[PDB]
Every structure is written in C-alpha cells, then in structure tokens.
Structure 1
C-alpha cells in the first residue's frame, strides 16, 4: 500500500558485486535451436536404470558432458582473462557451474572435472548439489573454481535468453524449455520435434563468433546424435 525501502544484505550482496563486475565484459550473444527428439527418447530408456541406482537423471548431465566434450575442442571457452585482458589462462579442469534456483535465491556450485566423469557420475554430483543447494548446505569447495556455466532456466520456462557471464569466466549457456514444435524430417513431412533453444554469451574481447558458433554446432551434434558421444568416451 505504501513504498518500502529495504537494505540489500547478507548473501544478496554477492549477486550485486558479481553482476557489476560483469559490466566489464563486452558480451557477445549467439543462439540456436537444437532438436532433442532422439535425446528425449534416449533419456526415457535410461531413466529406469538411473532410478534403480538411486539417481534422478534429468537432461543436464547430457548437456554437461556434451559441453565438456566441446570444451576439449574449444579450450578458449574454458579460460580466463586478467584485469586488462592481456593474458589468457586456459583452464584444464572443466568445473562447470550449475546456476540454481533456491528458496534463498540464486546460487552457482559447479561439478568438478566433468571431463573425467561419466554421465551417470554427473547425474550423481548434480543430485548431491541439488540436495545441498536446497538445504543451504553447499560447502565452500562446491562454490569456487567454476570455469564455465550452464543455466537451465528452461526447467522453469523460456525460449531464448541473454545470460550474464560470471567473472572470472568467459562464457555461459542458457537452456530454454524443451517444447514440441512442428518441423520437417528428411523427407519433407511434418513431425512432432522436441525443440530446445540455447543462448550462449561470450567475452567478445578474446572470443569471436565463429568460435562460439562452431562450439555450439559440436555441442549440438552431440545432443542431436548421442551416438556421436560414444565414439570417444572411455
């Protein structure tokens, strides 16, 4: 009924400082649509097996493993730049941030070394961070050393987004809601296709659009043809 002023305090101060710092980064945005039909079917087949082992298996572990495979080819997306952008540190660990919605607000823990982990282990680490995240119990180790971030806003809604990069990282992807849309198959007939949008943001000071685009294409081909991931996993 009246106006009400109220201090920004406690953990809310971190979002302020992080996003203010991100003003220093000139964001380039690139978007695509990915055809997740085969992946929806794949995830249905594997959901039981995961369930029997005590794991809820969403799409994220796939998005994460495909990201990491992309980062092997485009290691500049898993990198950091210094205050003046004079040097790049290419980071070897894929510590991939999971932006996560909580009752208390936004928090971003990461899954360490996705590069050495199976989809199933990623699923397992996810659950763990989700349980911990919702209980206010994430450790300091869960919150530091992130190298790259994915923000599945699509578990709530959306198509495209424009996500803000977390310094000191240089890139971030946001995933919209998987939605059934009419599309052509190879014959030229209209099918039910499960389509998801992706929105990447990158530090345009050292990352150009061809790089992001080729990264996205590789990422995309892994999810549109999960077979492709089999070739090189161990």
Structure 2
C-alpha cells in the first residue's frame, strides 16, 4: 500500500553482475519453428524404457544432443571471446548449461561433455541436476565451465524469446512451448502438427548470420528427422 525500498542482496547480486557483463555483447537474434511430431511420438515410445530404468525423460536430452551434434559442425558457437574480442578460444567440451530459476532465481548448471554422452546418459544427468537444484544443493563443479546454454522457457509458457548471452559464452537458445497447430503435409492436407519455436541469440562480433542459420537448420533437422541422429552415434 506504500513504496518499500530494498537492497539487491545475497544471491541476486550475481544476476546483476552477469547481465551487466552481457551488455558488452551485440546480440544477433535468429528464430525459427521446428516440427516435433516425430519427436513426440519418439518420446512417448521411449518413456516406458526410461521409466523402467528410473529416469524421467523430457525433450531436453534430445535438444541437448542435437545441439551437441550441431556444435561439432559449427565449433565457433561453442567458443569464448576475450576482453575486447581480439581472441577466440574454441572449446573442446560441449558443456551445455540448462538455465534454471530457483527460490533464488537464475542458476545455470551444465551437463559436462555432451559430445560423448548418450541421450540416455544426459537424461540421467539432467535428473541429477534437478534433484539438486530444486534442493538448493547444486555444487560448484556443476555450475562452472559451461560453454553454451539452452533454456526451456516452454516448460512454463512462451513462443519466441530474446535470451541474454551468458559471458563468456557466445550463444544461447530459448525453446518455447510445444503446441498443436494446423499444418500442411507433403499431400497438401491439414494435419495436427506438434510445433515448437526456437530463438537463438549470438555474439555477432565473431558469429555471423549464416552460421547461426546453418547451425539452426542442422539442429532442427536432427529433431524433425530423429533418424538423422542415428547415423553418427557410436
């Protein structure tokens, strides 16, 4: 009923620091829509196997592995840049951050080395990370050395977004809500289509539009055609 004034205190101080650092990066935005009908089908048929192993299976393992596969072809997106963007460090480890909000807001644990993990290992690893993170009990090692971030705004709502890049990373994407929409198929009839939006932000100092673009189509094509993923997994 009156104005209350307060200090930005405790943990909230870190978000201020991070997002201010983020103003030094000219964000380029590139968004698209991805047809997840196959993937949803795919997932429904994998839930029984993962449940039988003690693991809930979201879409995220899929998204994460596809980005990993994507970053093999476009390593620049898994890089870091220095104080005034004079030097680029290309990172070997695909340590993808899963953006989370807690009772304390922004916290970004990462799955280490997705490049050598199975979809199933990543499920397992996300499951550990939520258990811990909602328990307020996420460790330092889980929190450092991220190379690239995904953020599932769609777990709550949303179509497109403009996510903020997390220094020293050069990219992030946001995934919206999976939604049934009327869409045409090869036959030209109106199908139910399981449609999701993705928004990528990138540091346009060193990552051009074609690279985000091309990365995005590859990532996307792994998800629309999940067999495409089968070809290069070991």
Aligned to 2:182: 182
For structure 1, list consecutive stretches of 5 or more residues without a partner in the other structure.
none
The whole-number CA distance in structure 1 between the counterparts of 2:101 and 2:195 is 23
- CA–CA separation in structure 2 for the residues paired with 1:159 and 1:169: 23
User: What RMSD, in angstroms, separates the aligned Cα atoms of the two structures?
Assistant: 0.5
Measure, in 1, the Cα distance between the counterparts of 2:157 and 2:7: 30
SS in 2 for 1:232: coil
How far residue 76 of structure 1 moved from its aligned partner, in angstroms, is: 0.1
Counterpart CA distance in 2 for 1:197 and 1:150 is: 13
SS at match of 2:58: coil
Deviation at 1:104, TM superposition (A): 2.3
Q: What CA distance in whole angstroms lies between the structure 1 residues aligned with 2:54 and 2:103?
A: 25
Deviation track 1:119-149 (CA, whole Å, cap 9, x = no partner) reads 0000000010001000011110000000000
- Report the secondary structure of 1:25's partner residue: coil
Contact kept, 8 Å, 2:96 with 2:114, in 1: the verdict is yes
2:149–2:171 Cα contact (<8 Å) kept: yes
Residue in 1 aligned with 2:38? 38
The CA deviation at 1:106 is 1.8
Question: What is the count of residue pairs matched by the alignment?
Answer: 234
Give unpaired runs (5+ residues) of structure 2: none
Q: Using the TM superposition, give the Cα deviation of residue 226 of structure 1 relative to its aligned residue in structure 2, in angstroms.
A: 0.4
User: What do the CA deviations read for 1:175-214 (whole angstroms, capped 9, x no partner)?
Assistant: 0000000000001100000000000000000001000000
Counterpart CA distance in 2 for 1:104 and 1:3 is 22
Separation of aligned partners in 2, 1:105 and 1:80: 25
Q: Distance in 1 between matches of 2:94 and 2:132?
A: 21
Q: TM-score, normalised by structure 1?
A: 0.99
- Give the match's secondary structure for 1:183: strand
Aligned-residue offset at 1:219: 0.1
For residues 180 and 102 of structure 2, what CA distance do their matches in structure 1 show?
A: 28
CA–CA distance in 2 between the matches of 1:106 and 1:55?
25
Question: Where does residue 119 of structure 2 map in the other structure?
Answer: 119
> Do 2:183 and 2:193's aligned partners in 1 also have CA atoms closer than 8 Å?
yes
Provide the residue aligned with 1:93 in structure 2. Answer: 93
- Residue equivalent to 1:145: 145
Q: Equivalents in 2 of 1:24, 1:106: separation in Å? A: 20
SS of structure 1 residue aligned to 2:67: helix
What SS is found at the alignment partner of 2:142? helix
Deviation at 1:24, TM superposition (A): 0.1
Q: Distance in 2 between matches of 1:41 and 1:101?
A: 29
Aligned-residue offset at 1:64? 0.1
Deviation at 1:105, TM superposition (A): 1.3
Once the 2 structures are TM-superposed, how far is the Cα of residue 103 of structure 1 from its aligned partner?
A: 2.3
Structure 2 distance, partners of 1:86, 1:172, is 21
Separation in 2, partners of 1:61, 1:67: 10
